[PDB]
Amino acid sequence: NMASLIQRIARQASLTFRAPMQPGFPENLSKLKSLLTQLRAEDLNIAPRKATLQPLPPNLPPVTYMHIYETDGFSLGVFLLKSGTSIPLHDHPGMHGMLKVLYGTVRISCMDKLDRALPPEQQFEPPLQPREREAVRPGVLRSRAEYTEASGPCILTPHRDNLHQIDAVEGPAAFLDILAPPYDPDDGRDCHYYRVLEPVDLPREVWLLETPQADDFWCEGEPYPGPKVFP
């Protein structure tokens, strides 16, 4: 008589994401957060993964993705990070996101673009090439903390914490992620990667440089083992 928790999360995500403007949104978002707070790895039939202590060979991805469900309103799935890996700093243009750690520990660094020119004398280490000096833009580093399955969900919105980097801390980690709306490159909603620059206490201003997807980062799908989300 009772649907699985992941079914109920998907149903509530659909109700919640059909932006701030809509009425009933904050209450629906609060309810979704409370569902995610309850979620554990076992509810998805995902056993916690532990380190292999072996180097990662060049042909295997550092990160994998289990797809659970997607509509035009939201996407739902799990990202699984191997030991020592990171998902590089990236944005989510015009999107909301919700993350819940399932096992392991992640460091999430949260940032935003400030919407200015780099001062002429400013220097970075390593030094920038001329095209990079032209392209750097100001940002703000808002937070940088470690999260576990006990932390409860992390939220991002179109205008706050919209840039994040996610590092696996002391071994593999995995998290459930909801994006709303999902990315849509052909609609002009794409994922952009960034470098944070070190020139030569939070929140503090930083400098951001858009950069291609790192050569050693990519993500491949793998089968989702848990209860299925049904229309």
Binding site: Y65, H67, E70, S75, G77, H90, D177, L179, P182, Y183, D184, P185, D186, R189, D190, C191, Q213, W218, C219, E220
Partner: peptide
């Protein structure tokens, strides 16, 4: 190769 994903946008999946 590049795939247009809904979960990390235009993604070089290699």
């Amino acid at each position: 190769y590049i795939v247009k994903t809904f979960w990390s946008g235009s993604h070089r999946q290699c």
